Design a protein around this ligand. Structure first.
Ligand SMILES: [Mg+2]
Ligand SMILES: [Mg+2]
Ligand SMILES: [Mg+2]
Ligand SMILES: [Mg+2]
Ligand SMILES: [Mg+2]
Ligand SMILES: [Mg+2]
Ligand SMILES: [Mg+2]
Ligand SMILES: [Mg+2]
Ligand SMILES: [Mg+2]
Ligand SMILES: [Mg+2]
Ligand SMILES: [Mg+2]
Ligand SMILES: [Mg+2]
Ligand SMILES: [Mg+2]
Ligand SMILES: [Mg+2]
Ligand SMILES: [Mg+2]
Ligand SMILES: [Mg+2]
Ligand SMILES: [Mg+2]
Ligand SMILES: [Mg+2]
Ligand SMILES: [Mg+2]
Ligand SMILES: [Mg+2]
Ligand SMILES: [Mg+2]
Lengths: 260, 134, 169, 182
RNA sequence: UGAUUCAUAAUAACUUUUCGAAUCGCAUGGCCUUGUGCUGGCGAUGGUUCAUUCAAAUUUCUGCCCUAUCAACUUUCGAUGGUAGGAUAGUGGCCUACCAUGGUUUCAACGGGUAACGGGGAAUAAGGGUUCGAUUCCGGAGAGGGAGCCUGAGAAACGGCU
RNA sequence: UAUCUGGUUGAUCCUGCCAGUAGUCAUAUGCUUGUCUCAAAGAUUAAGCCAUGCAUGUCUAAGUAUAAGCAAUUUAUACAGUGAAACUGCGAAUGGCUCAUUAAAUCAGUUAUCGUUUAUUUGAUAGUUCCUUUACUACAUGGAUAUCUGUGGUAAUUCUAG
């Protein structure tokens, strides 16, 4: 209506915040950034509801101002900066380096990553075009645009970005039997190998993907992110490791593991 | 008799805010209510913090005396506590002073009045004075 | 009378409702880019005028009390370096930190000095900033060039590889 | 604008009012387990009713297959915890027929009386109301509490207040004062 | 790329030649051709098309409550299509010119009614249902009515204007 | 959590309805009303009319500050501490409200923009402005306008003429 909408109501807020239904009218609208509103995570939600390093919004703001937070090398001061999938949040006091990675259920898991790994960022490939002055450039689904990529870096590949410099360390070619991580819908957060690629002219390229448990599932190509070669992922994944157990199994795990 | 059995559950050390934040859990056996100052003192004794940089809020006792479950922080310094903690908390503690101000409605009215006038008010005053004869 | 101002170039000796945007006289627009229809009095002199504004340009005989006897000096003074220079009659070589009407005011017992906040100069800091900017412009460009060169080299290598792959059947 | 706080008009009236036999039965039940109203009975029925419905639903799918297996099992476990279900009966089709009487019997109403303490149901209820009885060491004053069986052995008189024996309690104090005066 | 007159790069010109940092806070380094010389840090804002994000208009398919005591309607005054222009941020009868006679319809067009804003949902509750949805979320409309426009990235805004 | 009863009859079994019965984040109202948590609440009639007040403005180490302000003292012989006012910026197109229109319209999911604009966003990035090439604007180009201070009009208005 009449131009860009500026608020986000707390029910309309995306579920993988894991916000309270109650406790205020609104939720933080993640501002214009390198990630899509619903597939993002603002710095309020991270430092208040997940980590609980700030008891409230004001506290979070204060922390931001203090400038111990750094989402992907640069500093940030905006409460509602959309830090999305693969973004590396480093709090310099604590030295609690994090990478924003999904849990098997779907929500963003707080992955307490080491200092040596929290340095690069793995990122997908959205486009490969040439800009002005005839220079080829790659675009990432995770924000950045990098000039001059190795000619054999094509669409839907993944790219290890040095992050500090904002360059290209290395890449993985998207292909059959190469470790992949899922970022869309019912399979969001799982991890698998890649078996097929149903081509389909226009209407969404599907991908048959099996996990470590030999459990198959299918997703669209845009909802899949190439994380390594089977056995060696390029990033440390959280406990569970994109398996996603059955409900019964989960229950069993819960009520077997009673260690007071 | 009672001994004010204090605990400090869920201790999160906060280098960002420069504090140790935690759930205060506390017991009364036969006493009823703990009191805030007392709690603060206890915390100080425990943590070597001093009341000045201890800061507590929340609580609401369980039901049938016995227990109380509030929220307490212990800043890395007094200065730090002062420059982070909200003002209300400070006031409650005694550290800071109560900020003497006008009513909200009154303030709003004043603002409106200001908006209605233009430039400096001195000129307006002068004009009024001049009119006084007319 | 009644109180609508005599706007210039309107003509008639009459009261006329007129649409007025920002840029003209006769409307202080309270929204940045707002037209509004205010009444305005024509530019011609008739009977209903309580007042005609008159610039007493060239002098005569009788100086009246304090209209042409006393002189109210200028409240403000040249703010830019260039402006100051113009005011004075100096040129660039005279150098800078003075030609300014510093004040001496008292609270009561204490009596101390005011000065301006004068603008535009060959400021050392400014110069430094400029230099830095220039360096950035240079250096960045150089880096870009280097990158381009590298890319070209890579491309060449790739081409060579392709050629090698080809020469077989 | 926060969100609608949800509720349920949980506890539901019967479809006829004056089925005489039914009424009599209800009255009898009340007498047995000292209730203030038929309301409580209705609530109990609703609670049980829901469970029954769930069981039926589960049955309507194949036991062996997943939801039925799991959800049903969970329900059974819950029932066992509550202490309405026995340990002999954990087969879902046993839940199907639990009965309201059983449910009533599990209340902190009766689990005071059943364990002695009070003497005469109503008395127990009164005691519960008047800030005695702590299931843990936290004073329950709801009659319709439903005791956890796992925490039925832990039902004591309150740490504070009389009967537990911390303070004698008001009338006693008055009497003492009178004696002193004398 | 499924697919282009695509990306994009050259040749040719025009252009009432856009842009191309006479910008603000800290800090005050490096070579002496010993001038005050030439040089160089941390940042702010602007500014170009390409990204992205927030969005934006449209747009594909399928789905609405009652009525035949509405069977024809649309097409002089755009109806349907074409060609060309004009306009628009752009598609397009959006508008103009010229031509063709189409287009929809008992698989209810068109008209009339709604004490109809749409949906999520609500009440009831064996199964199938029936009724309600002004109203906490998502959309859409409106700011007494109807019109018109300024500013602006975005309004046909009404705590803007005419 | 599949349930029916009274009523034509002289009595009987049906058609059949009436009547009861149960529910309603479904309204109203009549009595009554001690407590705990929770809480809708001028939609239904009049998208009827509105006194008064308030509901959008806003400056940082970092846009401009000789308030003839504050405050003052151990950077100003162009400036440097705070800062009313005003011009520049950005914001006021969000939010809130309401449901009048509106029935293939809106809306729901579903596509598409190879059919477009997109301040903001984060990523990016411009040696070619010269115009014959033996004496030419750079270590900083110009004049305005507001605050103010002054000369005012008006019965008045968030009025503004010199
Ligand atoms: Mg496509
Ligand atoms: Mg300057
Ligand atoms: Mg007591
Ligand atoms: Mg082209
Ligand atoms: Mg056309
Ligand atoms: Mg409806
Ligand atoms: Mg209506
Ligand atoms: Mg609705
Ligand atoms: Mg209505
Ligand atoms: Mg709405
Ligand atoms: Mg009205
Ligand atoms: Mg309007
Ligand atoms: Mg209004
Ligand atoms: Mg508005
Ligand atoms: Mg039925
Ligand atoms: Mg008959
Ligand atoms: Mg009879
Ligand atoms: Mg009836
Ligand atoms: Mg009304
Ligand atoms: Mg303003
Ligand atoms: Mg709105």
């Amino acid at each position: 209506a009449r131009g860009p909408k500026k608020h986000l109501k707390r029910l309309a807020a995306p579920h993988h915040w894991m916000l309270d239904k109650l406790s205020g009218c609104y939720a933080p609208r993640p501002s214009a950034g390198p990630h899509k509103l619903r597939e993002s995570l603002p710095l309020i939600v991270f430092l208040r509801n997940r980590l609980k390093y700030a008891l409230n919004g004001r506290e979070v703001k204060a922390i931001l101002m203090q400038r111990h937070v750094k989402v992907d090398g640069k500093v940030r001061t905006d409460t509602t900066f959309p830090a999305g999938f693969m973004d590396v949040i480093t709090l310099e006091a604590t030295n609690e380096n994090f990478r924003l990675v999904y849990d098997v259920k779907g929500r963003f898991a707080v992955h307490r990553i080491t200092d040596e790994e929290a340095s690069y960022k793995l990122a997908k490939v959205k486009k490969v075009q040439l800009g002005k002055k005839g220079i080829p450039y790659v675009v990432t689904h995770d924000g950045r645009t990098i000039r001059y990529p190795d000619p054999n870096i094509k669409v839907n590949d993944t790219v290890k970005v040095d992050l500090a410099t904002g360059t290209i360390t290395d890449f993985i070619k998207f292909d059959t039997g190469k470790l992949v991580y899922v970022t869309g819908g019912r399979n969001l957060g799982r991890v698998g190998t890649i078996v097929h690629r149903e081509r389909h002219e226009g209407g969404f390229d599907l991908v048959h993907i099996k996990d470590s448990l030999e459990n198959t599932f299918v997703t669209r190509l845009n909802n899949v992110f190439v994380i390594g070669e089977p056995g060696r992922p390029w990033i440390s994944l959280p406990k569970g490791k994109g398996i996603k157990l059955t409900i019964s199994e989960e229950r069993d795990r819960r009520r077997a593991q009673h260690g007071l | 008799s009672d001994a004010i059995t204090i605990r400090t559950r869920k201790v999160i050390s906060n280098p960002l805010l420069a504090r140790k934040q935690f759930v205060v859990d506390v017991l009364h056996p036969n006493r009823a209510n703990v009191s805030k100052d007392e709690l603060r003192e206890k915390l100080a004794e425990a943590y070597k913090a001093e009341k000045d940089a201890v800061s507590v809020f929340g609580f609401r006792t369980q039901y049938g005396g016995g227990k109380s479950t509030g929220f307490g922080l212990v800043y890395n310094s007094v200065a730090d506590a002062k420059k982070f903690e909200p003002a209300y908390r400070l006031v409650r503690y005694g550290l800071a002073e109560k900020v003497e101000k006008a009513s909200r409605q009154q303030r709003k009215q004043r603002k409106n009045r200001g908006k209605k006038i233009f430039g400096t008010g001195k000129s307006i005053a002068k004009k009024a004075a001049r009119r006084n004869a007319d | 009378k009644q109180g609508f101002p005599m706007k210039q170039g309107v003509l008639l000796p009459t009261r006329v409702k007129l649409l007025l945007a920002k840029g003209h006289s006769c409307y202080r627009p309270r929204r940045n880019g707002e037209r509004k229809r205010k009444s305005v009095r024509g530019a011609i002199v008739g009977p209903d005028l309580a007042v005609l504004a008159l610039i007493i340009t060239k002098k005569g005989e009788q100086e009246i009390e304090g209209i042409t006897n006393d002189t109210v000096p200028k409240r403000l003074g040249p703010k830019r370096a260039n402006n100051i220079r113009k005011f004075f009659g100096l040129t660039k070589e005279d150098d800078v930190r003075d030609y300014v009407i510093r004040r001496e005011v008292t609270k009561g017992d204490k009596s101390y000095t005011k000065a301006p906040k004068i603008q535009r100069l060959v400021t050392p800091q400014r110069l430094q900033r400029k230099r830095q900017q220039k360096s950035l412009k240079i250096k960045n460009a150089q880096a870009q060039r280097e990158a381009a060169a590298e890319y070209a080299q890579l491309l060449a290598k790739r081409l060579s590889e392709r050629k090698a792959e080809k020469a077989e059947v | 604008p926060r969100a609608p706080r949800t509720y349920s008009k949980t506890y539901s009236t019967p479809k006829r009012p004056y089925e005489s036999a039914r009424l009599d039965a209800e009255l009898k039940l009340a007498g047995e387990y000292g209730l203030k109203n038929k309301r409580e009975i209705y609530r109990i029925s609703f609670q049980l009713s829901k469970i029954r419905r769930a069981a039926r639903d589960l049955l309507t799918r194949d036991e062996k297959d997943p939801k039925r297996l799991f959800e049903g099992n969970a329900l059974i476990r819950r029932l066992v915890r509550i202490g309405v279900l026995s340990e002999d009966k954990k087969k879902l089709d046993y839940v199907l027929a639990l009965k309201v009487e059983d449910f009533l019997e599990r209340r902190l109403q009766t689990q005071v009386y059943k364990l002695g303490l009070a003497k005469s149901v109503h008395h127990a209820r009164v005691l519960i109301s008047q800030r005695h009885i702590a299931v843990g060491k936290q004073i329950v004053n709801i009659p319709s509490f439903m005791v956890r069986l796992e925490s039925e052995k832990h039902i004591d008189f309150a740490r504070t207040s009389p009967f537990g024996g911390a303070r004698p309690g008001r009338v006693a104090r008055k009497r003492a004062a009178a004696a002193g005066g004398e």
